[PDB]
Design a protein around this ligand. Structure first.
Ligand SMILES: CCCCCCCCCCCCCCCCCC(=O)OC[C@H](COP(=O)([O-])OCC(O)COP(=O)([O-])OC[C@@H](COC(=O)CCCCCCCCCCCCCCCCC)OC(=O)CCCCCCCCCCCCCCCCC)OC(=O)CCCCCCCCCCCCCCCCC
Ligand SMILES: CCCCCCCCCCCCCCCCCC(=O)OC[C@H](COP(=O)([O-])OCC[N+](C)(C)C)OC(=O)CCCCCCCCCCCCCCCCC
Ligand SMILES: CCCCCCCCCCCCCCCCCC(=O)OC[C@H](COP(=O)([O-])OCC[N+](C)(C)C)OC(=O)CCCCCCCCCCCCCCCCC
Ligand SMILES: CCCCCCCCCCCCCCCCCC(=O)OC[C@H](COP(=O)([O-])OCC[N+](C)(C)C)OC(=O)CCCCCCCCCCCCCCCCC
Ligand SMILES: CCCCCCCCCCCCCCCCCC(=O)OC[C@H](COP(=O)(O)OCCN)OC(=O)CCCCCCCCCCCCCCCCC
Ligand SMILES: CCCCCCCCCCCCCCCCCC(=O)OC[C@H](COP(=O)(O)OCCN)OC(=O)CCCCCCCCCCCCCCCCC
Ligand SMILES: CS(=O)(=O)C1CCN(c2cccc(Cn3cc(-c4nc(-c5ccc(OC(F)(F)F)cc5)no4)ccc3=O)c2)CC1
Ligand code: SF4
Ligand code: SF4
Ligand code: SF4
Lengths: 178, 70, 360, 80, 318, 56, 97, 156, 115
């Protein structure tokens, strides 16, 4: 179906009352007074402004911000160098080099992420079959230097050791929806 | 809320009141507790020069009454 | 200040998307369609997904389709907000921007809840959506939709019956229907001129044809009739969201074919076939049978289409994006004839121009 | 013609008002009984000195003193 | 003593310009559902000083294409005149009693346009020239109606002096007999200041900044403060002419108080209007002032020429 | 809601609408941030009989 | 009437922050003085408050401490001074402190 | 009354001004401009901090590179920056501006705005949450808090 | 003398501001900064070329209307005259002829801009 927005106008019938009403509208600026009234109403409303950085904007567990490599509760690393994360990373931001750890386990030596290439898409944490790489909630990690934004294994491991209390709970919340 | 605006309005109101009160009080202080005489036409200026002259000191606002005619 | 020629020099935001895509897989290429038109994201994801599904010969499930329509209309509202308010700003009115971006933020919250991102949610995917709705989201969408009409009314009160807005958007940027068809316009740039055309009623692409709504049509092909068309399309998007909320079916969200849509985590971690399929979909991808489509949808800007050529591989051989705004901007020199600078600003605005899709 | 005046009062009331006020400005002076008083007032003002005349002894209509009841009175202006 | 009076008239006007920028921002914010400056100081009473200090600490620009002489003179003149228009104002007693004060106002205002003209021409940039020509059009549009409105009002005051309006309104505002003229004068003062909906001289949506586009921190600050001072000036003019504060010779302080209240109201109305409306096209401004305001203005000038005659209400010459 | 029966009247008259019933702010009329756990369903191709991928 | 109650609320706000010294502390390092319940205090000194009668974005907030790992944070505060325990809460990802 | 103490306080004042009044420039290239807007919106009121978008570079103090920087646009960006008057700061917003991002390996993208202009602060994200861009603005505020220019002049 | 005093005080205030704006701050001048601004790219020409004017007729008319205003301004004094009928008639004739000229211009499309 369809409707008209500016064809409503029908044949012209005009009286003295209609003419006088249009004249008052044209001479006393009726329609503009109404915009003035709207802006006035907004002045006496509560502003939606939050007091950052004290009170902050809402978020959800699914928020995908800063990356971190997690561990099993034993302290062992979850990554096994399967390389799905870098195989799908559509920005080619991940870089991995694996090697048999002295104990024989399959682990990484290099795990680098150019956070100037990451598009923060989440494909790596939905590809990881061991829930090792995640995209944490932290977004307040700006820097004064480009180099600081080229994370390696130690940086991501430290982030994981810093946010686990939050990452784990957000996972526990969201992992049934996946 | 909207009442967070009254500080600036009050400041600017004080600042806009100051000029007139200042001008009035200064005119009174400088013209002998009187409003500064207005000279819109030459007659008023003539009157003021007359007053200036008759006043012992050349100042138009030193009014000389009946104490100075005998 | 009278304009005698407009020579738009696009390309300051060309990035080589259509080539990188050739160098990517399909999933690995999906986010480009979010990054193309960055105010109507879900619609681009939807077009891409529909094309890939056509080439795969699969059907997304009902719930996923209803969610796609829900968020498509939410994006229509987002984009019409942005269009109208930037139009006004570039014309002088500044408050509607601030009034409606507070609502844009709530809809970004919807995005973030369902995807994790406020703006570029790679949520719509070939086969459906990545992840089901979280409990308590439809209620919030209802609480937002039951009030949005009031904000549309406030804006209209500021603009519609205002003689200044009219003097700026009336008899301005006029387009005849035949010239529009020829120049290749689509959407509001076509309806404001009086053409009955909508790819949601003609050539429907989802549960559209199960949801009732009216198409707003203009008579004078001017910036005013297009602005009205956009407002009324927002209202009709509310009408559609009401139905999508009340009738949303139970079921799964992504095709139950684990050679296209990856399997759930709990099944990957206990089933061998599902683990294999996950591994392969996330490293290699899914092979798409050869062929070529041109799928188009009614994006809030107009007809957004993708011509997708496939070999028997996991990567596209060619993927061109047909952007509504290319031809709309090509028509600027014509629509600007006999007008001034400020009128040219108004005309740039009434086309709802975004350059991520024009230059891409 | 009434329909023309009406559609103008609806469409272009500014010119209607302009012509109406033009006509009223041109007419009302011909109408009012307080029009004669403008010149009488502007004449009553003593912007100059009322130079006196020499008493030739043949000016009965002329006064010898301001408060002598002779000459133009301003009562019509004291209660107007 | 006179220099102290100069100070008591000048420094408060500049402080009021600063806090007017403040009130502008905060009012527009609350209308736009936001707060406005509250961080820099208590509720933001230091943002203007921050802005000004920061500007007068920045590198100014001496471009290669500019006529530096006019480029530097124009802001000087703008500020000078913005501050000089405040001297003949009775609040209720002026610093300089002029018989032809209205004409002083008119001439100084019509002169403040040459700051914009010469700035935009000197800058030697296309957007600057566009702003200058738009100012030309704006003046050509409003200056005709300004003087006729003002004459029609003064034909019941009896003179061009600003201090006889006080005795004229001693009993009743001049808004009742002249509210049409008051409306037209309000919009024309809205235009005289290049203020929304007539912010065409610096229209950011068509001309990045207009005549300011090449100007930098210090001179730009001069231009800006001149604008926000002329705003208050024209509000004071409206509220001395058409609105009448209470004048009791033993109580001029009440006069200043009510004058200030009304001026604040009119300025807040200017800000309200900036927030509420889109921007004109500079041909439509001409069409307005020459097709709706000038005919009516002439009709009302004739009406107010006749009214003192068929009413015997001719005003006095002092 | 913090308004006080007078500002409300004023702004409802100025706007011409009953705003207090439709607010731009969210006061506890929203779903919580801590929901219970879900139990998602499964699609049709989760059977153990007459499910051969050569058919579907 | 109504003005009396709003003024009493304002007086509670002014007086309900320690004394004058604490009132000024909060007003000048947080730019807001509204009062709310206390939920907890982390080992770093950051206090977390709650007032559900305010609207969504404003019903939870923080008062960053003055010292955190040797940095004088009386004036120079940032959102990165919030540990994760309270991040998930403050950002309304959980209803559970 | 040591001149060094006086100079430290004067520099505190200088930085306070240049910091509490940061007028950026209306320079938005791609998606990230939307989050810039949203940071101008009620929830995050910029002017609340003293931030004001001026459209002329000759009046601006900082420029936020809010999106992808192509080779056809880099000359204009460098020109605008050059035309901004010292003191002038720069903020890279997003992953496109920092290192090209999702288009790093393209033939028409500069792999970082830091190649064309010098950058003070990098805001990561695609797009960065407006809250994050605000965090970056305040990080810049603090960096300005730590300029210590007049102390250097006095030590010379 | 006092008017001279005030106006010169304002001159000096403005000039002091400009001096301390041009000599206080640190500068770093170079051509790419001091060059004209044309939205990021280089000007294709000079801004000192003919910028056609489409309201030239309206400006010419504005001159004559300014003169008519100059002739209307002495009314506050002309109303203090004994010959009131003459002043009334002359003012009415003046304003009417002004309006008639404006109407002729309007009709002949002078107030409309060349396109
Ligand atoms: C002053 C009275 C006008 C302002 C006012 O708030 O009362 C009017 C009152 C408040 O209206 P509202 O917007 O519905 O109240 C919002 C909430 O109730 C707000 O309630 P709340 O629970 O959020 O707490 C509010 C609390 C706020 O707590 C405070 O004390 C902070 C006050 C801000 C100081 C700056 O108290 C006040 O708001 C009293 C305001 C006092 C005026 C402050 C500004 C004057 C500064 C003086 C310049 C120096 O409305 C009326 O009663 C009629 C209007 C009166 C016309 C004047
Ligand atoms: C009254 C007008 C005066 C008429 C007599 C002319 C007296 C001045 C002539 C001296 C040359 C000035 C000139 O034209 O130079 C061009 C300049 C244009 O800039 P410019 O081209 O000289 O730029 C030169 C750049 N530097 C400084 C680096 C060398 O304009 C002027 O200087 C004169 C502008 C006229 C202003 C007259 C009012 C003076 C106000 C009092 C101060
Ligand atoms: C010209 C007017 C005079 C300017 C006075 C500057 C006072 C600074 C101020 O108001 O804030 C306190 C400032 C606050 O600095 P701040 O920028 O860190 O305050 C921010 C606090 N939050 C983020 C919580 C909102 O105190 C100082 O840091 C010293 C700066 C001024 C030093 C001048 C000494 C003379
Ligand atoms: C009504 C308007 C009111 C607003 C105007 C009020 C502004 C008053 C501000 C007073 C503060 C005075 C100090 C400001 C100096 C800032 C200039 C500057 O940053 O240059 C640094 C300069 C830099 O010195 P430098 O020697 O290190 O420079 C070396 C060379 N460069 C810069 C290339 C590396 O410091 C000074 O020389 C200024 C000394 C301070 C005293 C000046 C008098
Ligand atoms: C016996 C009686 C004898 C006396 C004779 C007089 C009799 C009374 C006559 C009354 C006449 C009404 C007053 C005249 C003023 C209004 C003039 C006018 O109507 O102009 C209308 C003009 C055109 O409007 P438009 O809709 O485009 O129509 C175009 C024509 N087809 O559009 C406009 O001009 C208005 C648009 C301006 C927009 C700018 C923003 C306006 C802001 C509004 C603020 C209002 C606050 C007023 C404050 C005043 C306090 C001083
Ligand atoms: C230098 C380059 C910059 C130039 C720009 C300077 C700013 C210009 C400001 C605009 C002035 C234009 C209008 C002309 C001045 C106003 C004339 C005036 O008001 O009257 C002069 C005054 C007497 O006037 P009046 O009251 O009518 O006579 C009866 C008094 N009992 O008493 C007088 O006779 C005093 C006349 C002096 C007028 C002041 C001019 C100062 C010029 C400084 C340079
Ligand atoms: C989207 S919006 O609708 O929100 C939009 C509305 C408009 N808006 C706005 C309004 C007012 C001012 C500004 C900041 N601003 C300030 C100056 C400038 N100010 C002074 C100055 C000199 C002396 C002063 O006094 C003393 F220092 F004491 F002498 C005080 C000040 N010089 O330059 C120049 C340019 C500028 O943008 C911004 C916010 C945004
Ligand atoms: S979120 Fe996406 S772009 Fe970022 S590292 Fe993971 S896979 Fe790569
Ligand atoms: S997907 Fe997970 S386990 Fe595999 S390489 Fe990446 S981080 Fe390691
Ligand atoms: S970083 Fe992401 S959001 Fe920002 S401009 Fe690039 S693609 Fe768009």
């Amino acid at each position: 179906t369809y409707k008209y927005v500016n064809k409503k106008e029908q044949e012209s019938e005009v009286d003295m009352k209609s003419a006088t009403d249009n004249a008052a509208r044209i001479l006393m600026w009726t329609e503009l007074i109404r915009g003035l009234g709207m802006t006035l109403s907004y002045l006496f409303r509560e502003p939606a402004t939050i007091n950052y950085p004290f009170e902050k904007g809402p978020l959800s567990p699914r928020f995908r911000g800063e990356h971190a490599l997690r561990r099993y509760p034993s302290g062992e690393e979850r990554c096994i160098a399967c390389k799905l994360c870098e195989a799908i990373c559509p920005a080619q931001a991940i870089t991995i080099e694996a090697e048999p750890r002295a104990d024989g386990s399959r682990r990484t030596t290099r795990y680098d992420i150019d956070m100037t290439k990451c598009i923060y898409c989440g494909f790596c944490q939905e590809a990881c079959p061991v829930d090792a790489i995640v995209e944490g909630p932290n977004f307040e990690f700006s820097t004064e230097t480009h180099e600081e934004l080229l994370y390696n294994k130690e940086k991501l491991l430290n982030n994981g050791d810093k946010w686990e209390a939050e990452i784990a709970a957000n996972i526990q919340a969201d992992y049934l929806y996946r | 809320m909207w009442f967070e605006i009254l500080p600036g309005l009050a400041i600017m109101g004080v600042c806009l009141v100051i000029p007139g009160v200042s001008t009035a009080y200064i005119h009174k202080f400088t013209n002998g507790g009187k409003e500064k005489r207005v000279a819109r036409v030459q007659y008023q200026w003539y009157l003021m020069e007359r007053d200036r002259r008759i006043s012992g000191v050349n100042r138009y606002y030193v009014s000389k009454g009946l104490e100075n005619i005998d | 200040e009278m304009v005698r020629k407009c020579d738009p020099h696009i390309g300051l935001l060309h990035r080589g998307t259509e080539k990188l895509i050739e160098y990517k897989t399909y999933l690995q290429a999906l986010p480009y369609f979010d990054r193309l038109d960055y105010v109507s994201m879900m619609c681009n994801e939807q077009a891409y997904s529909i094309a890939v599904e056509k080439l795969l010969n699969i059907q997304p499930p009902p719930r996923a389709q209803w969610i796609r329509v829900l968020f498509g209309e939410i994006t229509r509202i987002l984009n019409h907000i942005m269009a109208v308010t930037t139009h006004a700003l570039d014309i002088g009115a500044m408050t509607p921007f601030f009034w409606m971006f507070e609502e844009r933020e709530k809809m970004f919250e919807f995005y973030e809840r369902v995807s994790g991102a406020r703006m570029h949610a790679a949520y719509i995917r070939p086969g459906g959506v990545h992840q089901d709705l979280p409990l308590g989201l439809l209620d919030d969408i209802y609480e937002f939709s039951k009030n949005f009409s009031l904000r549309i009314d406030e804006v209209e009160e500021m603009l519609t019956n205002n003689r200044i807005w009219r003097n700026r958007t009336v008899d301005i940027g006029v387009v005849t229907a035949e010239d529009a068809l020829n120049y290749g316009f689509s959407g509001v740039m076509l309806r404001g001129s009086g053409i009955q055309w909508d790819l949601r009623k003609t050539q429907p692409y989802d549960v559209y044809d199960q949801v009732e709504f009216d198409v707003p049509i203009g008579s004078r092909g001017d910036c005013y009739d297009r602005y009205l068309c956009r407002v009324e399309e927002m209202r009709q998007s509310l009408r559609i969201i009401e139905q999508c909320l009340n009738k949303m079916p139970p079921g799964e969200i992504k095709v139950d074919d684990a050679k296209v849509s990856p399997p759930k985590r709990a099944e990957m971690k206990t089933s061998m076939e599902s683990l294999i399929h996950h591994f392969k979909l996330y490293t290699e991808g899914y092979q798409v049978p050869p062929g070529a489509t041109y799928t188009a949808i009614e994006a809030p800007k107009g007809e957004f289409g993708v011509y997708l050529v496939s070999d028997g591989s996991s990567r596209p051989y060619r993927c061109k994006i047909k952007a509504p705004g290319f031809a709309h901007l090509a028509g600027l020199d014509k629509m600007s004839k006999g007008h001034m600078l400020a009128d040219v600003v108004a005309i740039i605005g009434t086309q709802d121009i975004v350059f991520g899709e024009i230059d891409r | 013609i009434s329909a023309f005046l009406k559609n103008a009062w609806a469409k272009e009331p500014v010119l209607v008002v302009s012509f109406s006020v033009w006509g009223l400005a041109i007419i009302m002076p011909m109408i009012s009984p307080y029009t004669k008083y403008a010149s009488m007032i502007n004449k009553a003002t003593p912007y100059n000195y009322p130079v006196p005349v020499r008493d030739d002894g043949n000016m009965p209509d002329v006064p010898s003193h301001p408060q002598d009841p002779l000459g133009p009175s301003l009562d019509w202006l004291k209660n107007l | 003593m006179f220099f102290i009076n100069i100070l008591t008239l000048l420094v408060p006007i500049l402080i009021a310009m600063a806090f007017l920028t403040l009130v502008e921002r905060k009012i527009l914010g609350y209308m736009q559902l936001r707060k406005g400056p509250n961080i820099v100081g208590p509720y933001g009473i230091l943002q203007p000083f921050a802005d000004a200090m920061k500007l007068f600490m920045k590198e100014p620009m001496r471009p290669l294409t500019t006529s530096m002489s006019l480029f530097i003179i124009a802001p000087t003149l703008s500020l000078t005149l913005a501050l000089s228009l405040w001297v003949p104002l009775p609040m209720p007693h002026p610093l300089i009693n002029l018989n032809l004060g209205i004409l002083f106002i008119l001439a100084t205002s019509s002169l403040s346009v040459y700051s914009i003209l010469w700035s935009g021409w000197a800058s030697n940039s296309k957007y600057s020239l566009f702003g200058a020509l738009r100012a030309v059009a704006q003046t050509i549009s409003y200056e005709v109606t300004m003087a006729i409105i003002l004459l029609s009002v003064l034909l019941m005051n009896g003179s061009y002096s600003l201090q006889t309006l006080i005795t004229t309104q001693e009993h009743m505002w001049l808004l009742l007999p002249a509210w049409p003229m008051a409306m037209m004068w309000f919009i024309s003062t809205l235009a005289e200041t290049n203020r929304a909906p007539f912010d065409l001289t610096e229209g950011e949506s068509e001309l990045v900044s207009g005549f300011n586009v090449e100007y930098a921190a210090g001179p730009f600050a001069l231009f800006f403060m001149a604008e926000y001072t002329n705003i208050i000036l024209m509000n004071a003019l409206t509220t001395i002419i058409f609105l009448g504060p209470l004048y009791y010779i033993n109580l001029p302080e009440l006069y200043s108080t009510n004058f200030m209240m009304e001026a604040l109201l009119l300025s807040s109305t200017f800000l309200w209007i900036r927030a509420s409306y889109p921007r004109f096209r500079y041909d439509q401004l001409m069409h307005l002032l020459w097709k709706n305001f000038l005919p009516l203005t002439l009709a009302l000038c004739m009406w107010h020429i006749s009214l003192p005659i068929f009413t015997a209400g001719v005003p006095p010459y002092m | 809601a913090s308004a006080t029966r007078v500002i409300q009247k004023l702004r409802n008259w100025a706007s011409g609408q009953d705003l207090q019933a439709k607010l731009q702010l969210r006061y506890q009329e929203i779903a919580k941030r801590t929901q219970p756990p879900p139990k998602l369903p499964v699609g049709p191709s989760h059977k153990l009989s007459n499910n051969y991928y050569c058919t579907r | 009437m109504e003005l009396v109650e709003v003024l009493k609320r304002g007086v509670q706000q002014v007086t309900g922050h320690g004394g004058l010294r604490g009132l000024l502390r909060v007003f000048f390092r947080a730019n807001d003085i509204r009062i709310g319940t206390l939920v907890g205090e982390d080992k770093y000194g950051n206090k977390y408050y709650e007032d559900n009668k305010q609207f969504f974005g404003r019903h939870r907030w923080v008062i960053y401490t003055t010292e955190m790992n040797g940095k004088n944070t009386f004036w120079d505060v940032d959102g990165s001074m919030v540990p994760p325990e309270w991040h998930r809460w403050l950002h309304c990802m959980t209803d559970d402190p | 009354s040591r001149a060094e103490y006086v100079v430290t306080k004067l520099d505190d004042l200088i930085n306070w001004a240049r910091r509490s009044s940061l007028w950026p420039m209306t320079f938005g290239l791609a998606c990230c401009a939307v989050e810039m807007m949203h940071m101008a919106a009620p929830r995050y009121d910029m002017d609340r901090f003293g931030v004001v978008f001026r459209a002329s570079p000759r009046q601006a103090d900082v420029m936020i590179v809010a999106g992808t920087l192509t080779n056809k646009m880099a000359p204009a960006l460098r020109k605008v920056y050059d035309q901004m008057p010292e003191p002038r700061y720069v903020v890279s917003m997003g992953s496109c501006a920092n290192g090209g991002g999702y288009y790093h390996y393209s033939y028409s993208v500069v792999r970082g705005c830091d190649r064309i202009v010098p950058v003070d602060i990098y805001v990561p994200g695609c797009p960065p949450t407006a809250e994050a861009l605000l965090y970056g603005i305040l990080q810049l505020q603090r960096k300005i808090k730590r300029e210590q220019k007049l102390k250097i002049w006095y030590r010379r | 003398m006092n008017l001279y005093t005030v106006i010169f005080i304002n001159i000096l205030l403005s000039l002091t501001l400009i001096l301390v704006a041009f000599w206080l701050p640190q500068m770093n001048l170079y051509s790419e900064k001091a060059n004209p601004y044309e939205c990021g790219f280089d000007p294709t020409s000079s801004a000192r070329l003919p910028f056609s004017m489409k309201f030239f007729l309206v400006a010419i008319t504005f001159l004559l209307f300014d003169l008519e205003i100059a002739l209307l301004l002495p009314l506050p004094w002309a109303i203090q005259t004994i010959k009131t009928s003459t002043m009334m008639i002359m003012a009415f004739i003046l304003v009417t002829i002004l309006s008639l000229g404006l109407a002729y211009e309007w009709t002949q499309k002078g107030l409309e801009w060349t396109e």
